Amino acid sequence: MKFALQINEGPYQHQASDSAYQFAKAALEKGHEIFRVFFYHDGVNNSTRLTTPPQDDRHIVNRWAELAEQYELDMVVCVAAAQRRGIVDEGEASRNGKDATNIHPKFRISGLGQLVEAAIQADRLVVFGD
Amino acid sequence: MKFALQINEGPYQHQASDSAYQFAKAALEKGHEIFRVFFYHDGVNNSTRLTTPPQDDRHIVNRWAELAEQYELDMVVCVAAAQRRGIVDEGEASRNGKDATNIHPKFRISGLGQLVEAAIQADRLVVFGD
Amino acid sequence: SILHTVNKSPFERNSLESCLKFATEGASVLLFEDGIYAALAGTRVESQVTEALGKLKLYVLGPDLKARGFSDERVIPGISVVDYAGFVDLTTECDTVQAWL
Amino acid sequence: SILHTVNKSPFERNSLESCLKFATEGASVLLFEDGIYAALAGTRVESQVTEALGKLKLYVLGPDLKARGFSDERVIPGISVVDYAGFVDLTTECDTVQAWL
Amino acid sequence: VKKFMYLNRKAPYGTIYAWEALEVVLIGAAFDQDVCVLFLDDGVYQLTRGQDTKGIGMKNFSPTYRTLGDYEVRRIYVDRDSLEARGLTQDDLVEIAFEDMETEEEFDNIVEVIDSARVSELMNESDAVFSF
Amino acid sequence: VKKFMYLNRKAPYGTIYAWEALEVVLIGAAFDQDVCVLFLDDGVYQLTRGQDTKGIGMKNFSPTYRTLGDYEVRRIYVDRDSLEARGLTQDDLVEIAFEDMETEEEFDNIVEVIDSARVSELMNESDAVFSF
Numbered sequence: 001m002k003f004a005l006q007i008n009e010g011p012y013q014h015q016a017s018d019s020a021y022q023f024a025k026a027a028l029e030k031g032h033e034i035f036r037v038f039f040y041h042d043g044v045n046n047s048t049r050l051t052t053p054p055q056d057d058r059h060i061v062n063r064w065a066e067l068a069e070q071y072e073l074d075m076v077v078c079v080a081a082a083q084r085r086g087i088v089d090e091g092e093a094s095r096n097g098k099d100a101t102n103i104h105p106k107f108r109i110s111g112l113g114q115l116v117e118a119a120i121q122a123d124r125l126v127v128f129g130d
Numbered sequence: 131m132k133f134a135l136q137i138n139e140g141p142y143q144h145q146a147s148d149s150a151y152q153f154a155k156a157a158l159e160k161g162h163e164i165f166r167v168f169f170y171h172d173g174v175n176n177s178t179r180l181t182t183p184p185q186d187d188r189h190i191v192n193r194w195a196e197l198a199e200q201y202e203l204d205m206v207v208c209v210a211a212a213q214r215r216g217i218v219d220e221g222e223a224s225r226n227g228k229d230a231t232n233i234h235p236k237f238r239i240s241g242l243g244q245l246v247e248a249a250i251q252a253d254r255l256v257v258f259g260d
Numbered sequence: 261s262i263l264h265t266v267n268k269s270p271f272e273r274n275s276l277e278s279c280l281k282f283a284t285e286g287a288s289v290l291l292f293e294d295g296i297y298a299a300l301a302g303t304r305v306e307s308q309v310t311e312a313l314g315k316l317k318l319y320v321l322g323p324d325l326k327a328r329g330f331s332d333e334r335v336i337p338g339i340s341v342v343d344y345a346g347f348v349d350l351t352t353e354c355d356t357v358q359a360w361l
Numbered sequence: 362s363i364l365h366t367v368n369k370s371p372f373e374r375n376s377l378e379s380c381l382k383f384a385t386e387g388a389s390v391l392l393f394e395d396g397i398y399a400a401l402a403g404t405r406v407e408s409q410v411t412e413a414l415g416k417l418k419l420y421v422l423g424p425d426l427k428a429r430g431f432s433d434e435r436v437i438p439g440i441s442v443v444d445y446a447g448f449v450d451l452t453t454e455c456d457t458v459q460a461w462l
Numbered sequence: 463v464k465k466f467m468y469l470n471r472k473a474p475y476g477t478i479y480a481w482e483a484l485e486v487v488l489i490g491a492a493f494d495q496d497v498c499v500l501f502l503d504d505g506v507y508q509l510t511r512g513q514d515t516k517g518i519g520m521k522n523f524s525p526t527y528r529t530l531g532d533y534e535v536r537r538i539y540v541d542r543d544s545l546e547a548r549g550l551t552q553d554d555l556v557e558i559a560f561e562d563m564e565t566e567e568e569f570d571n572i573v574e575v576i577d578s579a580r581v582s583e584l585m586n587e588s589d590a591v592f593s594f
Numbered sequence: 595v596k597k598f599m600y601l602n603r604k605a606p607y608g609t610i611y612a613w614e615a616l617e618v619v620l621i622g623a624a625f626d627q628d629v630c631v632l633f634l635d636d637g638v639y640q641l642t643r644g645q646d647t648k649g650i651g652m653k654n655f656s657p658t659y660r661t662l663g664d665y666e667v668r669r670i671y672v673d674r675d676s677l678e679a680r681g682l683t684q685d686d687l688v689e690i691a692f693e694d695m696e697t698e699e700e701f702d703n704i705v706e707v708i709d710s711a712r713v714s715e716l717m718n719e720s721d722a723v724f725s726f
Contacts, residue, residue: 001453006593008462008594010172010215011214011215012214012610013140013172013215013609014609014610015368015394015395015650016368016394018650018651018652019393019394019650022424022445022650023445023448023449025445026444026445026446026449027449029446030446030449032453040482040486041143041478041594042143042172045140045215048216049228050216050217050228050230050232051213051214051215051216052214052222052226053213053214054213056653057652057653058651058652080485081482083181083182084141084142084181084182084184085140085141085143085178086175086178086179086180086181086232088180092182096182098179098180100180100230100231101230102180102216102232111489112485112486112489113489115486116486116490116493116495117493119464119466119590119592120493120495124452124453124457124458124590125458125590125591125592126452126458126460127460127462127591128368128460129368129460130369130462131352136724136725138611138726142478143477143478144476144478145267145293145294145475145477146293148518148519149292149518151519152323152344152518152519153344153348155344156343156345156347156348157348159345160348162348162352170614170618171610171611171614171726186521187521188519188521210617243621243622243625245618245621246618246621246622246625246627247625249596249598249724250595250596250625250627253352254351254352254356254357254722255357255722255723255724256359257357257359257361257724257725258267258359259267259359259361259725259726260268262717262718267476268476269476269504271375271503271504271547272374272375272472272473272503273373273374274373274635278634278635281710282634282710282714282717283714284714284718293475293476294475294476294477294504297504297507300548300549302548302549302550303547303548303549304547304548304549306549323518324518326514326515326516326517327514327517327518327520327522328473328507328510328513329507329510329511329524329554330510355721356720356721356722356723357723358601358717358720358723358725359725360603360725361603361725361726362586363585363586368608369608370605370608370636372635372679372680373605373635373636379471379502379503382578383582383585384582385582394607394608395605395607395608395609395636398636398639398680401680401681402681404680404681405681423649424649424650425607425649425650427645427646427647428606428607428646428647428649428650428652429605429606429607429642429645430639430642430646431644432644444649456589457589457591458591459467459469459588459591459593460591460593461471461593462471462472462594
């Protein structure tokens with residue numbers, strides 16, 4: 001079965017990302033395929049590499065990075081949502097003229113058509129939000 | 131009167147920040163004093179300088195910066211809240227070993243104590259959130 | 261003495277109910293942000309809100325009523341409409357502000 | 362054919378109600394995250410939740426029950442407890458997933 | 463080939479969900495799938511008419527809803543029970559014109575207020591549901 | 595000098611409000627103001643006992659509630675109507691010991707369950723209220 005996971009909230013503030021992650025690990029481990037993980041709304045905030053979370057608790061960003069690494073997951077961040085909230089990569093930094101970037105290399109910025117794209121290709125569209 | 135505004139949510143996602151801003155500008159114009167604007171929880175995200183919001187709409191971060199500029203407001207960003215979500219300044223970059231910073235120069239990072247501190251110094255504690 | 265603030269829709273959150281339950285005689289309540297829908301005549305909660313006019317002073321923020329598509333005429337008689345300047349005033353007239361989130 | 366998912370407290374949000382109102386004969390419902398509290402026996406919504414057992418298949422995410430201090434024993438008889446591996450299976454058994462936020 | 467439902471249940475401006483959800487529908491229009499937008503609970507407040515956001519310092523994005531026909535969005539439903547509990551009628555909502563340029567027919571307003579049973583029907587017909 | 599109320603009305607783990615609110619109480623303890631913590635509505639679920647967060651991959655922060663005594667937090671109330679609505683009794687909550695080292699007296703538990711009237715009284719006595 002092919003999955004498509006949509007995440008609408010930022011890390012720690014709402015459980016959504018943690019739930020989505022637990023779901024993705026369990027699905028992946030069962031042999032299922034995760035076509036794409038798409039972050040929207042505050043969800044895009046799960047792609048910054050600038051977090052320094054309490055060491056005695058989970059590191060949501062790095063966790064997603066590792067799962068992505070292991071199973072070669074395509075994790076997409078909505079550009080418009082990223083622009084409004086501050087998620088910047090090479091491209092954006094250049095085009096928007098920022099003096100720095102903060103996106104974690106395991107995540108890529110792209111258009112919202114990547115989310116609709118996923119919904120069509122995957123068998124199931126699971127959304128985790130508020 | 132002396133005010134202490136607390137904002138617990140991020141920009142755009144929730145109206146909180148906008149409301150506090152409107153509240154602040156209306157209070158300042160009336161001659162009152164805003165002792166301190168403190169960002170906690172996702173609120174700390176109103177301090178990043180990496181946003182590029184739609185031009186035909188308000189630029190939340192800069193707005194706050196302009197108002198802070200005009201009335202010399204003391205805008206504080208919970209440090210612990212920032213480490214969790216990804217807000218970084220010179221210090222944090224240096225202590226956490228991050229390859230960049232993203233805080234707007236008009237906001238300062240500090241302790242949660244600064245929140246309690248304001249609660250005591252101000253006549254009114256107005257909290258904006260979800 | 262207390263100025264309660266309810267910023268959430270009474271059809272989505274229990275905040276409005278909780279606020280009306282603990283606010284006491286002589287207190288003020290201000291409906292703003294999505295809280296606005298509770299000051300509209302005709303809804304499922306007009307009755308209880310109206311009941312509240314008894315011992316409480318009710319206010320709704322104009323800017324948010326308009327932004328959502330409602331004029332002062334769509335409001336429940338007895339509930340006063342104020343703007344941000346008025347919102348500020350309410351916070352200085354009362355002794356303490358208490359946000360029901 | 363439809364696996365509904367409710368992630369919010371029935372004492373804070375109207376999401377549980379709306380779901381129970383539209384979910385139809387033979388559909389599944391999964392209470393997780395803060396939506397767990399609706400599966401606990403003895404709450405103010407026990408009966409309506411119990412009522413739904415009639416035409417619906419109700420599940421609650423174990424991980425979240427324990428996280429909030431509740432053993433499967435505290436659950437309403439009839440609501441099946443599942444873990445994430447179970448969550449996954451529910452999304453594959455049904456034909457579609459509808460999230461009630 | 464696929465039937466998509468866009469489930470809108472939150473009031474506008476209090477949160478960004480209303481606006482950003484609208485963005486997905488415009489983009490999803492291009493993939494020409496059987497799209498249908500449903501407004502339930504506080505979602506109905508998303509289509510109210512006469513919004514004036516000047517006072518809260520935000521951009522008023524409601525006009526965009528009225529352009530959904532140009533994007534080929536034909537299926538736009540509204541739960542009446544919700545309208546009722548909120549004391550509204552279709553008259554409180556905006557109109558969304560649509561013209562099947564392929565057959566000339568012009569409709570003045572395709573916003574359909576439906577009953578609960580119909581709503582449960584549409585859910586069961588959907589292959590995928592977008593929630594905000 | 596001032597009376598501070600920490601209003602907690604949200605459930606734990608679903609949102610960070612529970613945890614980060616608690617953080618504020620601890621930090622405000624050092625400024626020695628007359629502090630009182632109130633749990634209302636779903637906030638009561640914050641003091642439940644037996645939390646085991648291993649399943650959800652998060653750190654269980656409940657133990658921190660049981661140490662508020664050591665931070666001079668004497669006033670800790672809980673709305674009974676709220677417990678009753680959720681089918682709970684003070685037996686479902688954790689105990690928070692407190693010893694006034696200044697006068698020897700040692701209490702096994704200062705978590706006091708109060709009635710609506712009392713709750714309203716407390717709000718009216720507070721000079722400032724923190725919300726989350």
